[PDB]
DNA sequence: TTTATCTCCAGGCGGTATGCACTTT
DNA sequence: AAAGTGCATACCGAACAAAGATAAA
């Protein structure tokens, strides 16, 4: 069955008591709960086991005997854990051999195995050593055999990656070993501090008397708040302990896990980092709970002593990546980490959701109650009355209402006037300064000390992790190796581009290119009310945009002269995203413009041509002509490129007219240097070259269905010119609009030259995924409301027209595609009726489950400001959402296939010594190597679709969901619908190896 | 379903109630959803100047037959009173209409707020949309926009029993006292001009004219005494402190004060303003332990004006437009 | 007659008054 | 004999803001 909320909170209390090392409290609570008949039923075996282990670690035998008497009296039979704890304590106390003989003889009478004791998950290495010493008394020798390291994966797709009989050319960095070790020390200290301070990049404020007065007042308020928070924390601790001594549950051990100073510092950081509009109570609560769990994991590691083990293993591991050092046998970084001997990192038990929300709420209430401020800041001592800093206000949306903490209006003005020149970032949000830890298991990886989860999910979900941990160990090797390869790409920031961006941003901003503008340059009876409303709104959006830009630019300027790495993880489907949110290459055009590779490569014979093709692709003017025409066009506009590179702001300004600004500039800056060099074939390029794929989902449908016309339509066959379905759909829509406009309808006249590929691209893409007309209307409206050359008053009448015509253009565009989509949709629905969520396995081997469940019926926490309502993700007892599982089956499957293709390509590029990074379907590299990647890509695609993916999926679905005969009629229906798979066509995938524009 | 007058006795009783005043009977009565035209024909027999606002086109020619011979007394305009001045923007479709266009086609000029009532709208509230219609009317009235832009136009509408009871709740606390009652009794003078059993009104569904014993069965299910309620906007609604710019803060204050019904005024005031709550409650005259439910609408308006009249503190409210749309 | 509307990059209403069970004064 | 403690459901606000197209519900 499943545990109740109190049965979770009590277990969490007992487990936390072991870490906090207050066993008397746990013993008292257990005795009180066992004594009363009503609370006796709540206690389970694990609650006795936790206290028994805690007592055994100390070395008290009387208490362990008493708890064993309690558990034998209450009910149930002792399990292996109780006997393991008994042996551990008996060995601790140097018990006589006769007692050990008797205990183990009884244990054999029940009938178990001593090996399972040393394979117990809970027991650590020290506990295992102690119990081994204890058992060595009765048996003079006891041993557990070692084994060969985990076998390499044996599958059709991944065989070549893990085969030793071959030639390997694994790359290496460009840095000395000592520099790498120093960077490791810097990153370790940074993570231990848990904060970084960055010098603000905004325009400095000239000193004045008012600024100094504001700073002094701020300092005084900070000191007063610190003292008040310390006193409040002490009082709360005492009050919560008194409840424990009354035989009631509380959060005393949870609040005793960290020092008072650290909690106070975290609370002041949260107060200093509060937006002027405030935040909802539930959001502030999840944030405070999460920050406390991270600080406890880092501090536990520091106190125990794993920090030193990581330092030694890492410093020895850094020999593989450094250029100077050499490895006896080259291998994948995960393989070397395992072979070098792996320190054991024990997973941290996640707190239950109710406890997390309760702790967050308690901390937020303490923060709001403890801080107070004088009412009159400008006028000192006018009134001795003290006003709260934060206020609890309701905000009403439709019937519903929300609670919000809002700062006092004078505090915001004081902060604005003070203009502190230092921003504070959390260590998790900043890019690392040392190479990432190799992903060796789902539990450990990415950051040095902070906890990072493999599959990013909601704060309480656990089904994905248990599915990951229940699979064979060798299945996830490919995914882990791909993640490690992606995270091991050194980065750097461009200098002159950053200087130009700073010049534009600091002075006035250039909203045309993308740089926001300062609030100073802002626009300025019913009519007056409307004008003020518009002004306030516009000021709000511009302020938010400038705040985000300020954060990103400050972070970028901090790393001006450093090398940094970006770790990656994945979602539940399988697509990979970088971990640092603020600054990465997945962001806007400026983000893609500032970043560049750190390890350059010579251009070679075929580097300049690919650079020119990349420049033309970024420009966007020529996207239908072949490669020769793009190269010729790049040749034609050489003067404009050189002028833009030499004079970016004072000149002909050709680059600003590109579709992708700030990247055309960088590419021109590189191309001019390459051209002006004495030998352009011996020039080092640090600039990645993008490589995109057209109609990727349509490509995967074409591959699975093997439909000849569909394959030919999406560049999946050899051709001389690119093929685009979107352009054909746009042409058909334009023909229909021309006929309608000649007939006389006004909206046809309104939108005449605004039917481009952009407006219909997303809709045509998402039709095959089963999008409805409402979503298509919203997409077309969103596209239309940004042209700025279209009369907006027709938008509702425009999109509502276009969608229909667009859907018209699709009676019979796809047949096998829609057959496959309908089959998947019907299978998902029929599975969803029986109450079982749909699951599948990707060709790489990772398992995917789609967690859509009906809402929990009530979930509130009682309290002294408001009753927080929170969803209970983490209840497997709820019923599945048939509507959201039906709609999401195709897109998740195709995204998983895309991720598999990307991972295979990345691994086979790493084997040849390539710097491969990717964004979903865009494959970056150095300029010289692009052609090589192209080849392997096609190969992988063919292999990825050489296996019968659809047949394997059908058989797996039949095995998993039709084995149970519980509903015989519906089981027969599901068997019938799953045993009918659409037949393939007549298409030989070898032609993919020769097609030029499959990726272009 | 839509309710249309069915009998001539009703057609004359309602007409007499509408045009009861014998001194200056001339008003350009605006009648909405005429339906068959029985009420309009009765009003013409009594003598008036009707600007009919039918929603459906099918009835439009039919009314044209009744008033074809009459020259200027009756004007049929295809419009809906409850869709005037859409806030979405764009082109105004024929089913909707803009207030300026209507008051230009009718020739009505602009009348100051303190002056006499220019017009008189009559009709029935939506069958299932009383709350939304009342809230839209409240926003239009408190902001001097749309109809109430031109003046303090009287509105006389048929409403149900439950919404009327919720609209006429007092500090006597029948546990129906809420913000809608406060604003509507602060901005109007609600009176029960007449009462009618609901079965006395013909019911036409969107599908067609309702018939069959189901109509008789429906009669027992929804039997409630419909009230014809008269609303005139109050002359002294707007003051120095209460202006069309500051109505949002008053609305937020009233909504917040009813978030916790069983709470005192001082707690909400602490949650809403940085001012000394005890001093304010001393100025307004009420006691410290004053419940929100035991406050009159005039007390709420006086409290809001007293807070807004505080010169000493530069910052008065924590209300901000960022608190909306979230 | 009533409601949600392709997927992902991690989201949720807060108050009042009612019974029902059992433990505690 | 009364009274406290804690958990389950149910009905309140239906804050306005035009409109149309499809099927699970
Ligand atoms: N379901 C869904 N998938 C999307 C959406 N946007 C992008 N994708 C997926 O992302 C893939 C590639 O994204 P894009 O590069 O933007 O699309 P594309 O078809 O490659 O575009 P072109 O390069 O112009 O051909 C698509 O094939 C889809 O699988 C979306 O809104 N919904
Ligand atoms: Mg693409």
CSV table of C-alpha atoms in Angstrom, one decimal, chain A residues 739-888:
chain,number,residue,atom,x,y,z
A,739,UNK,CA,-9.3,34.1,-55.3
A,740,UNK,CA,-11.1,35.3,-52.2
A,741,UNK,CA,-9.7,38.9,-52.6
A,742,UNK,CA,-10.8,39.0,-56.2
A,743,UNK,CA,-14.2,37.9,-55.0
A,744,UNK,CA,-14.4,40.8,-52.7
A,745,UNK,CA,-13.8,40.0,-49.0
A,746,UNK,CA,-12.2,42.8,-47.0
A,747,UNK,CA,-9.9,40.7,-44.7
A,748,UNK,CA,-8.3,39.3,-47.9
A,749,UNK,CA,-7.4,42.8,-49.0
A,750,UNK,CA,-6.1,43.6,-45.5
A,751,UNK,CA,-3.4,40.9,-45.5
A,752,UNK,CA,-1.9,40.7,-49.0
A,753,UNK,CA,1.9,40.6,-48.6
A,754,UNK,CA,2.0,39.3,-45.1
A,755,UNK,CA,1.5,35.6,-45.8
A,756,UNK,CA,5.1,34.4,-45.4
A,757,UNK,CA,6.6,31.1,-44.3
A,758,UNK,CA,6.9,32.2,-40.7
A,759,UNK,CA,3.1,32.6,-40.0
A,760,UNK,CA,2.2,29.1,-41.2
A,761,UNK,CA,5.4,27.3,-40.2
A,762,UNK,CA,4.4,26.4,-36.6
A,763,UNK,CA,0.8,25.5,-37.5
A,764,UNK,CA,1.9,23.2,-40.4
A,765,UNK,CA,4.5,21.7,-38.1
A,766,UNK,CA,2.0,21.0,-35.3
A,767,UNK,CA,-0.8,19.7,-37.4
A,768,UNK,CA,0.8,16.2,-37.5
A,769,UNK,CA,0.8,16.3,-33.7
A,770,UNK,CA,-3.0,16.7,-33.5
A,771,UNK,CA,-3.2,20.4,-32.8
A,772,UNK,CA,-6.7,21.8,-32.6
A,773,UNK,CA,-8.1,24.9,-34.4
A,774,UNK,CA,-8.1,27.0,-31.2
A,775,UNK,CA,-4.3,26.5,-30.8
A,776,UNK,CA,-3.7,27.2,-34.5
A,777,UNK,CA,-5.7,30.4,-34.2
A,778,UNK,CA,-3.6,31.5,-31.2
A,779,UNK,CA,-0.3,30.7,-33.0
A,780,UNK,CA,-1.3,32.7,-36.1
A,781,UNK,CA,-2.6,35.6,-33.9
A,782,UNK,CA,0.7,35.6,-32.0
A,783,UNK,CA,2.7,35.7,-35.3
A,784,UNK,CA,0.4,38.4,-36.8
A,785,UNK,CA,0.6,40.7,-33.7
A,786,UNK,CA,4.3,41.3,-34.3
A,787,UNK,CA,4.6,42.4,-37.9
A,788,UNK,CA,4.1,46.1,-37.0
A,789,UNK,CA,3.1,46.8,-40.7
A,790,UNK,CA,-0.3,45.0,-40.5
A,791,UNK,CA,-3.5,46.7,-39.4
A,792,UNK,CA,-4.0,45.1,-36.0
A,793,UNK,CA,-7.8,45.8,-35.8
A,794,UNK,CA,-8.3,42.8,-38.1
A,795,UNK,CA,-6.2,40.3,-36.1
A,796,UNK,CA,-9.2,38.3,-34.7
A,797,UNK,CA,-10.8,38.3,-38.2
A,798,UNK,CA,-7.4,37.6,-39.8
A,799,UNK,CA,-6.3,34.5,-38.0
A,800,UNK,CA,-9.8,33.0,-37.8
A,801,UNK,CA,-9.6,33.2,-41.6
A,802,UNK,CA,-6.1,31.9,-42.2
A,803,UNK,CA,-6.4,28.8,-40.0
A,804,UNK,CA,-9.4,27.5,-42.0
A,805,UNK,CA,-7.6,28.1,-45.2
A,806,UNK,CA,-4.4,26.5,-43.7
A,807,UNK,CA,-6.4,23.5,-42.6
A,808,UNK,CA,-7.9,23.4,-46.0
A,809,UNK,CA,-4.5,23.2,-47.5
A,810,UNK,CA,-4.3,19.9,-45.6
A,811,UNK,CA,-7.2,17.6,-46.6
A,812,UNK,CA,-4.7,15.1,-48.3
A,813,UNK,CA,-1.1,16.3,-47.8
A,814,UNK,CA,-0.2,13.4,-45.5
A,815,UNK,CA,-1.6,9.9,-45.5
A,816,UNK,CA,0.8,7.5,-43.8
A,817,UNK,CA,1.8,10.2,-41.4
A,818,UNK,CA,-1.8,10.7,-40.2
A,819,UNK,CA,-2.3,6.9,-40.1
A,820,UNK,CA,0.7,6.5,-37.8
A,821,UNK,CA,-0.5,9.4,-35.6
A,822,UNK,CA,-4.0,8.1,-35.4
A,823,UNK,CA,-2.7,4.6,-34.4
A,824,UNK,CA,-0.5,6.1,-31.7
A,825,UNK,CA,-3.4,8.3,-30.4
A,826,UNK,CA,-5.9,5.5,-30.3
A,827,UNK,CA,-3.4,3.2,-28.5
A,828,UNK,CA,-2.7,5.9,-26.0
A,829,UNK,CA,-6.4,6.4,-25.3
A,830,UNK,CA,-7.2,2.8,-25.0
A,831,UNK,CA,-4.3,2.3,-22.6
A,832,UNK,CA,-5.4,5.3,-20.6
A,833,UNK,CA,-8.9,4.0,-20.0
A,834,UNK,CA,-7.6,1.0,-17.9
A,835,UNK,CA,-5.9,3.4,-15.5
A,836,UNK,CA,-2.3,2.7,-16.5
A,837,UNK,CA,-0.1,5.5,-17.9
A,838,UNK,CA,1.7,4.8,-21.1
A,839,UNK,CA,5.3,3.8,-21.1
A,840,UNK,CA,7.9,3.0,-23.7
A,841,UNK,CA,11.6,2.4,-24.3
A,842,UNK,CA,13.8,4.4,-26.7
A,843,UNK,CA,16.2,2.6,-29.0
A,844,UNK,CA,19.1,3.7,-26.8
A,845,UNK,CA,17.5,1.9,-23.9
A,846,UNK,CA,16.3,4.5,-21.5
A,847,UNK,CA,12.7,4.1,-20.2
A,848,UNK,CA,10.1,6.9,-20.6
A,849,UNK,CA,6.8,7.2,-18.7
A,850,UNK,CA,4.2,9.9,-19.2
A,851,UNK,CA,2.9,11.1,-15.8
A,852,UNK,CA,-0.5,12.8,-16.3
A,853,UNK,CA,-2.8,12.3,-13.3
A,854,UNK,CA,-6.1,13.8,-12.2
A,855,UNK,CA,-5.9,16.5,-9.5
A,856,UNK,CA,-5.5,15.7,-5.8
A,857,UNK,CA,-8.8,16.3,-3.9
A,858,UNK,CA,-7.7,19.0,-1.4
A,859,UNK,CA,-4.2,19.6,-0.1
A,860,UNK,CA,-4.0,22.5,2.4
A,861,UNK,CA,-1.6,23.3,5.3
A,862,UNK,CA,-3.2,25.1,8.4
A,863,UNK,CA,-1.3,28.0,9.8
A,864,UNK,CA,-1.0,31.6,11.1
A,865,UNK,CA,-1.1,33.7,7.9
A,866,UNK,CA,-2.9,31.7,5.3
A,867,UNK,CA,-3.7,28.0,4.4
A,868,UNK,CA,-1.4,27.2,1.5
A,869,UNK,CA,-2.9,24.8,-1.2
A,870,UNK,CA,-0.3,22.7,-3.0
A,871,UNK,CA,-0.7,19.9,-5.6
A,872,UNK,CA,0.3,16.3,-4.5
A,873,UNK,CA,2.5,15.2,-7.5
A,874,UNK,CA,3.7,12.0,-6.0
A,875,UNK,CA,0.4,10.3,-5.5
A,876,UNK,CA,0.3,7.2,-7.6
A,877,UNK,CA,-3.2,6.6,-6.3
A,878,UNK,CA,-4.8,9.2,-8.5
A,879,UNK,CA,-6.6,8.4,-11.8
A,880,UNK,CA,-4.8,9.1,-15.2
A,881,UNK,CA,-5.8,12.1,-17.3
A,882,UNK,CA,-7.1,10.5,-20.6
A,883,UNK,CA,-7.2,13.9,-22.4
A,884,UNK,CA,-3.6,14.9,-21.6
A,885,UNK,CA,-2.2,11.4,-22.2
A,886,UNK,CA,-4.0,11.1,-25.6
A,887,UNK,CA,-2.7,14.4,-26.9
A,888,UNK,CA,1.0,14.0,-25.8
